Design an enzyme around this catalytic site. Structure first.
Site, short mmCIF file in Angstrom:
data_model
loop_
_atom_site.label_atom_id
_atom_site.label_comp_id
_atom_site.label_asym_id
_atom_site.label_seq_id
_atom_site.Cartn_x
_atom_site.Cartn_y
_atom_site.Cartn_z
N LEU A 1 -5.98 -6.14 -2.22
CA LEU A 1 -6.83 -6.58 -1.10
C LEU A 1 -7.96 -5.42 -0.95
CD1 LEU A 1 -4.92 -8.10 1.56
CD2 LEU A 1 -6.00 -9.35 -0.48
N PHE B 1 -7.68 6.50 0.78
CA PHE B 1 -6.83 6.34 1.58
C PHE B 1 -5.43 5.62 1.17
CE2 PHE B 1 -8.53 1.82 1.01
CZ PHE B 1 -7.37 1.06 1.13
N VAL C 1 -4.47 -1.57 0.11
CA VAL C 1 -3.74 -2.79 0.79
C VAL C 1 -3.40 -3.66 -0.26
CG1 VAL C 1 -4.19 -4.16 2.81
CG2 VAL C 1 -5.11 -1.92 2.82
N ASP D 1 -14.96 5.44 13.77
CA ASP D 1 -15.04 5.01 12.69
C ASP D 1 -15.26 3.71 12.49
OD1 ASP D 1 -15.57 5.94 9.95
OD2 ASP D 1 -13.31 5.72 9.47
#
Ligand SMILES: Cn1c2c(c3ccc(Cl)c(Cl)c31)[C@H](C#N)C1(CCNCC1)NC2=O
Ligand SMILES: Cn1c2c(c3ccc(Cl)c(Cl)c31)[C@H](C#N)C1(CCNCC1)NC2=O
Length: 331
Positions: free
Chosen positions: A22, A27, A30, A143
């Protein structure tokens, strides 16, 4: 190397079967999973990159979502629901309810066309209601950006433009969210959605999120950011182009005095960077694509969200009462 442990067909926590990717970035990743211990429900799993920044952000995100999800168990205020977390081959894994594309991804996969005004209204109300809930709970997101606003279901119609069937959103990415009582980091927000009090290092709180949302709505309206830069000085120059001079009190208080000559921005308008700013940036109202009063109401709200002084800046509680939102209350 992280990809060694999140291939499709891989099973996490002996239940979550990877079926698709996804999102991915610095980071981590996903992935969409089938949950074999919840009747084959599809879920999202954020597999966190094994580096300081992201590990610490993930540990904080987990704490913030426990509190927000406990506080609002029906998700009336549209923060994503975290189902659980676990560790897989040394990676932190956060399980969420499945959401669709981000508003960014939607815009991009629509060839950077903007959103229709009626969807912008419905999205702006849900974003203000969601982040206002944070603000009632002594939190600041820090953010907010289109990538952190996701559609619940991103199925669309396509004609001579894609149109969402349902423009309902939720807010994700709570790893930076800061409680009022905490010591505040200096560098908050992604460049393009950063408030003037952050750039000038004046201290920030809930109002820096209002600024970020103002930047979001103009991006939804135009299909492009109005602050396209990677430089603090240029960014302040663009703010001056779009919104006029900074208040003297914020100039006088800043430690970033070198940025200013007398009490105005030390900026060559006639340099290559100065011409770039004059080309890409202009006074806020000149960005309107119709003089139709609904477009004027949206721009009035954005202007109040982009008030320089974070004390005078409109609150999300006030934003929800703005006339731009009356066509949602006509029922
Ligand atoms: C697709 N995606 C993404 C996130 C999700 C968080 C929750 C859920 Cl349900 C999904 Cl689908 C997410 C991440 C968070 N939080 C971010 C992390 C980086 N900023 C954008 C949101 N990236 C995703 O691709
Ligand atoms: C609950 N928490 C928090 C942080 C963590 C960093 C690492 C870890 Cl293990 C945890 Cl639990 C954290 C960060 C620090 N210091 C921030 C993360 C987001 N706001 C700024 C500091 N705040 C926390 O309360």
């Amino acid at each position: 190397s992280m990809h060694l442990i999140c291939q499709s067909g891989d099973v996490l926590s002996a239940r979550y079967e990877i079926v698709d990717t996804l999102g991915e970035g610095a980071f981590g990743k996903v992935v969409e999973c089938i949950d074999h211990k919840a009747g084959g429900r599809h879920v999202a799993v954020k597999i966190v990159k094994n580096v300081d920044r992201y590990c610490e952000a993930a540990r904080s995100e987990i704490q913030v979502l426990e509190h927000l999800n406990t506080t609002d168990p029906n998700s009336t205020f549209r923060c994503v629901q975290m189902l659980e977390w676990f560790e897989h081959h040394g990676h932190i894994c956060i399980v969420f309810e499945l959401l669709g594309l981000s508003t960014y991804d939607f815009i991009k996969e629509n060839g950077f066309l903007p959103f229709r005004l009626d969807h912008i209204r419905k999205m702006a109300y849900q974003i203000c209601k969601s982040v206002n809930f944070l603000h009632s709970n002594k939190l600041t997101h820090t953010d907010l950006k289109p990538e952190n606003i996701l559609f619940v279901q991103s199925d669309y119609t396509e004609a001579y433009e894609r149109t969402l069937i349902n423009p309902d959103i939720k807010v994700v990415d709570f790893g930076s969210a800061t409680y009022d009582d905490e010591h505040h980091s200096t560098l908050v927000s992604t460049r393009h959605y950063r408030a003037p009090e952050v750039i000038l290092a004046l201290g920030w709180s809930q109002p820096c999120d209002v600024w970020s949302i103002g930047c979001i709505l103009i991006e939804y309206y135009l299909g492009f950011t109005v602050f396209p830069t990677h430089d603090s000085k240029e960014h302040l120059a663009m703010m001056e182009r779009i919104l006029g001079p900074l208040p003297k009190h914020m100039i006088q208080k800043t430690r970033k005095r070198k940025y200013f000559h007398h009490d105005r921005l030390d900026w060559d308008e006639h340099s290559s960077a100065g011409r770039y700013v004059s080309r890409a940036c202009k006074p806020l109202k000149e960005f309107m694509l119709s003089q139709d009063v609904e477009h004027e109401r949206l721009f009035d709200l954005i202007q109040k969200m982009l008030e320089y002084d974070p004390a005078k800046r409109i609150t999300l509680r006030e934003a929800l009462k703005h006339p731009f939102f009356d066509l949602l209350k006509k029922s």
